[PDB]
Amino acid sequence: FVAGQAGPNYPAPVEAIKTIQKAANFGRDKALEVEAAGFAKLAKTSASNCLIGLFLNDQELKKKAKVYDKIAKDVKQAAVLGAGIMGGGIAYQSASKGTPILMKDINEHGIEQGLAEAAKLLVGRVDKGRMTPAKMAEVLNGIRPTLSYGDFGNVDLVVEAVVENPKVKQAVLAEVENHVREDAILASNTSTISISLLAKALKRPENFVGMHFFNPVHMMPLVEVIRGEKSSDLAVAT
Amino acid sequence: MIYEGKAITVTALESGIVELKFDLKGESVNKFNRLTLNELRQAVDAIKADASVKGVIVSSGKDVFIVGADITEFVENFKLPDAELIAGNLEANKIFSDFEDLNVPTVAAINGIALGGGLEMCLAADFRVMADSAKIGLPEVKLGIYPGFGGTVRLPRLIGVDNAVEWIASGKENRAEDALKVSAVDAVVTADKLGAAALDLIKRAISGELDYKAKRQPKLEKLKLNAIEQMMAFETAKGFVAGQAGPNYPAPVEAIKTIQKAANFGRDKALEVEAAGFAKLAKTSASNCLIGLFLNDQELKKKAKVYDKIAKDVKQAAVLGAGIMGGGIAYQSASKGTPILMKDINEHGIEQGLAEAAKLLVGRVDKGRMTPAKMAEVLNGIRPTLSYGDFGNVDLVVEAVVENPKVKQAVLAEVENHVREDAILASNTSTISISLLAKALKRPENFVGMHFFNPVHMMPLVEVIRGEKSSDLAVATTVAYAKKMGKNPIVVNDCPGFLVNRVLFPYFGGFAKLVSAGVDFVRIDKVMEKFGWPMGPAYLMDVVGIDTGHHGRDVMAEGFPDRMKDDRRSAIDALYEAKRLGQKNGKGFYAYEKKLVDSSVLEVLKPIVYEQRDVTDEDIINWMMIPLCLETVRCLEDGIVETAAEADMGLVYGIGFPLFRGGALRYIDSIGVAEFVALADQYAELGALYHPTAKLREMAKNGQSFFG
Ligand SMILES: NC(=O)c1ccc[n+]([C@@H]2O[C@H](COP(=O)([O-])OP(=O)(O)OC[C@H]3O[C@@H](n4cnc5c(N)ncnc54)[C@H](O)[C@@H]3O)[C@@H](O)[C@H]2O)c1
Numbered sequence A: 001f002v003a004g005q006a007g008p009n010y011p012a013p014v015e016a017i018k019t020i021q022k023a024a025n026f027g028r029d030k031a032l033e034v035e036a037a038g039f040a041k042l043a044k045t046s047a048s049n050c051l052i053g054l055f056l057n058d059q060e061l062k063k064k065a066k067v068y069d070k071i072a073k074d075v076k077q078a079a080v081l082g083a084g085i086m087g088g089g090i091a092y093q094s095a096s097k098g099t100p101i102l103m104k105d106i107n108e109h110g111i112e113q114g115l116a117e118a119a120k121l122l123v124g125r126v127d128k129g130r131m132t133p134a135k136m137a138e139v140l141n142g143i144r145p146t147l148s149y150g151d152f153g154n155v156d157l158v159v160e161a162v163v164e165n166p167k168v169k170q171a172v173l174a175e176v177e178n179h180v181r182e183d184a185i186l187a188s189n190t191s192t193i194s195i196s197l198l199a200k201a202l203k204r205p206e207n208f209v210g211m212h213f214f215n216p217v218h219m220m221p222l223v224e225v226i227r228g229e230k231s232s233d234l235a236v237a238t
Numbered sequence B: 001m002i003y004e005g006k007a008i009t010v011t012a013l014e015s016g017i018v019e020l021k022f023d024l025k026g027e028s029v030n031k032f033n034r035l036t037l038n039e040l041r042q043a044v045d046a047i048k049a050d051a052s053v054k055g056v057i058v059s060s061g062k063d064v065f066i067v068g069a070d071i072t073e074f075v076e077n078f079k080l081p082d083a084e085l086i087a088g089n090l091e092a093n094k095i096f097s098d099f100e101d102l103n104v105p106t107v108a109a110i111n112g113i114a115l116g117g118g119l120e121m122c123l124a125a126d127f128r129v130m131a132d133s134a135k136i137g138l139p140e141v142k143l144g145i146y147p148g149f150g151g152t153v154r155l156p157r158l159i160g161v162d163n164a165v166e167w168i169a170s171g172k173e174n175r176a177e178d179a180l181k182v183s184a185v186d187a188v189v190t191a192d193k194l195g196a197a198a199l200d201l202i203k204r205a206i207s208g209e210l211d212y213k214a215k216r217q218p219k220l221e222k223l224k225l226n227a228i229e230q231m232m233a234f235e236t237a238k239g240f241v242a243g244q245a246g247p248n249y250p251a252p253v254e255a256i257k258t259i260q261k262a263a264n265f266g267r268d269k270a271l272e273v274e275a276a277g278f279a280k281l282a283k284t285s286a287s288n289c290l291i292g293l294f295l296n297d298q299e300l301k302k303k304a305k306v307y308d309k310i311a312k313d314v315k316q317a318a319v320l321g322a323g324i325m326g327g328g329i330a331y332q333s334a335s336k337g338t339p340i341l342m343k344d345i346n347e348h349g350i351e352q353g354l355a356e357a358a359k360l361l362v363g364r365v366d367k368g369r370m371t372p373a374k375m376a377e378v379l380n381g382i383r384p385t386l387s388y389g390d391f392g393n394v395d396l397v398v399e400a401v402v403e404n405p406k407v408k409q410a411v412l413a414e415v416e417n418h419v420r421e422d423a424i425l426a427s428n429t430s431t432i433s434i435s436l437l438a439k440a441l442k443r444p445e446n447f448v449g450m451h452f453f454n455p456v457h458m459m460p461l462v463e464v465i466r467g468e469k470s471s472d473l474a475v476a477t478t479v480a481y482a483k484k485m486g487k488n489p490i491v492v493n494d495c496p497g498f499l500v501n502r503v504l505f506p507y508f509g510g511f512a513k514l515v516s517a518g519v520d521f522v523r524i525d526k527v528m529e530k531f532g533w534p535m536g537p538a539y540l541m542d543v544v545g546i547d548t549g550h551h552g553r554d555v556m557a558e559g560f561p562d563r564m565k566d567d568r569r570s571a572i573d574a575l576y577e578a579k580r581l582g583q584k585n586g587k588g589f590y591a592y593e594k595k596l597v598d599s600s601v602l603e604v605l606k607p608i609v610y611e612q613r614d615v616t617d618e619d620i621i622n623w624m625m626i627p628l629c630l631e632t633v634r635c636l637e638d639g640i641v642e643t644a645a646e647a648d649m650g651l652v653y654g655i656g657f658p659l660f661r662g663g664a665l666r667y668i669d670s671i672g673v674a675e676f677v678a679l680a681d682q683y684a685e686l687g688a689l690y691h692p693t694a695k696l697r698e699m700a701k702n703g704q705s706f707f708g
């Protein structure tokens, strides 16, 4: 079972079994001798020190992370400019964790697709026994659809999910910076367009950075925080 | 061909099999009128002689299969003497019986809706094939009667006593899936394949594969149940229905008592029991009343087609409020498929709105009545907001702001600047004039009144108030948007109290007088709830709230001083001045800790008890009904409700008028327009609220009635 879901590359998983398999007829003493014997064998394997290195790198990361939290602001009101694929996903993740996120779009049909897939996910688990409907409601209440920037009055961070087009993105982001606060942080989700370029449109590029999510937004872990030449430390930290 | 009528065509087919199709040329649907019964009669006698016949397949040429006969013919038939009516069914059932005793395999191809006699027709056959997109049922009880064409005889023996009692006592339609489970149908197939389904089945019966003689036997003999089992099977059924229907509707229970008698008889004697009871129910002073509602319904539908010619669909609704009424209106709108906005000045407001709007959907999901996938859709339609930024494409707005003319004018006016010009505005006020709140807008033409009730998701009625500056399109749009939310809209001209409220208080006036007359209110509402009312006058004042019934009184006073003014102190005042405010406060006529009689009220109602006049029950009924009815009469003469049918249905949905009585106006007809006038003079010593009108007295002389 393990060999088919782990791979011949990870010795530890299988060695643990072989160990228990040998001491299957011994007492505690002889069992311990089999335990330590295998422990030494794994402590020298190449997969060991590497996995150990991963966690070794994890610590350094969390340490750097703590440096950000010293100036980072807690977005108590998020907002995304889009829906459907990426827009809806970003609106989902934000709500699923406890962050009222807005869903702005130029057409009603767009907001439809956004809420559509954002619903198939929650219900997709309730119809299996993994989430309480009471929770599905809370999540669906955090997401607030809109066709105007009238509710962006208190957004702490905006994520642009508009189509890949520098010309367009500049007109959009610029239009948003007029409604949002001045301390508010803007962000782009582009994957093939320069941030430093999309930043020359804003009148306050300091509060602009890059937040690159992946497809699907609710499955992929990584979220690159791109820093433009005009980006500030606070913008990135946030 | 073998036979050819104007509603039935019997065409021959392969292997001797012959098809009997129900196709009423000229009309849209099929139904057992006087003609069809005669043509089917000849059709059977034709197949009964044709020796080349090897099987019969009953089909339908129209969309639906076979629905109930014309409602108009029903009334005409339910006036004939009991002896003549029984003979009408005794000979009717004979027709279907002959098709049943036909020495040849018979199968029905239910392609579409098969209700009332339609299903009874199929029951006569041996086998039954149904299209998955069809529905079958016996909605006979929806009129105060039960299956008269052998329904109460063949169904119980085909699908079992219990299942039969349900299908009959409820009169609900049944989907394809459920129809097969109870064996009401023998097989379900796609629409296109329904044809061969019948043909293939016939051949498998003729050859002997499917013993049709044995499958037909069950409904030609006594029930299979034990005597002991029968005792329970019926008594429990009776006890169940009687506890969820009420002693006011005979049909539901009579059906059971019928099946209970024929529980040991064959088809013949069973039919004798069916017809016997059918005649008994056809004469009840409840049956024709329910039938009256069916008529009023048809009148509303025809008028409905009028508004549906100038009403723009509301693909984007929006309400200015939340919490109680605002949240409800936002719920109903979304629950039916209409993205509705929720505007509010403070965030806490939107909180309450979405709160209760959530406890409703989740309230059903946690019971197995709604899919979470649906709960999401509904919660996605509701779009909270604190600004008018999203009102750019709203087709209709409903104001749920607190009762305050000054405020409502500032709000509505502010909205008209953001919404389009063709957009329709509306008010949900219950104690404020629309014509007054309309003088603030620069386009009063697009302004009307949409009055919902509490709770918004429970109450059916939705009055469509029309201001002096209101347009026909504005009204029509509101009606359609109301009907689309699964409601029952009825246009009402702007006036203090409108329709429901204008009749509710004069009704409460009789209550106030009773209390002041030393009449125990606990007894009063016990006679009213027995009369048919869901909740008695007293217990009703608590549900609505004394503080509410008090303000509403003042509104009706300044509105109709000539007959609705009062200078004395009623029990309504004794409570408002005793911090007692109803169910919300936990203190009214009863104590609400769920409904107890507390003697701590006697010390408060003393200042109201004037005389100590004696009184029976029949009096209480008149001390209450006379005012309500007479007022309804005025709401028709003065020119408020366009018709009499709409007038009654307005109460049937709003105040919850006893269904087995038809309504306020029809109630007068039940007792007689002329006799009612005399009933008004006997208690005329109680004010103008008990004095008939010059028009009510006149029509009482000509013998005319409201629904003649
Ligand atoms: N292929 C992928 O799935 C993928 C992978 C990685 C990154 N991305 C990033 O995602 C973004 C594109 O998002 P998508 O995949 O949902 O595209 P999409 O075409 O699926 O959806 C575009 C949405 O943006 C809305 N929109 C467009 N212009 C708008 C404006 N001016 N204001 C408001 N709403 C507007 C549209 O109405 C629509 O709802 C890009 O930045 C792209 O680099 C996509």
Ligand SMILES: NC(=O)c1ccc[n+]([C@@H]2O[C@H](COP(=O)([O-])OP(=O)(O)OC[C@H]3O[C@@H](n4cnc5c(N)ncnc54)[C@H](O)[C@@H]3O)[C@@H](O)[C@H]2O)c1
Pocket (backbone or CB within 6 Å): B320, B321, B322, B323, B324, B325, B326, B343, B344, B345, B346, B348, B349, B350, B399, B400, B401, B402, B403, B411, B428, B429, B430, B431, B452, B453, B454, B544, B548
């Ligand atoms: N007794 C009842 O329950 C009952 C029965 C019938 C009809 N009504 C009608 O219902 C209405 C009262 O509504 P309610 O029960 O929600 O009152 P409420 O006091 O419970 O709630 C008022 C809500 O309206 C919001 N509001 C106030 N002014 C606003 C504005 N300008 N724009 C947007 N939102 C605004 C408030 O923030 C609040 O959320 C009245 O018209 C009343 O006649 C009530």
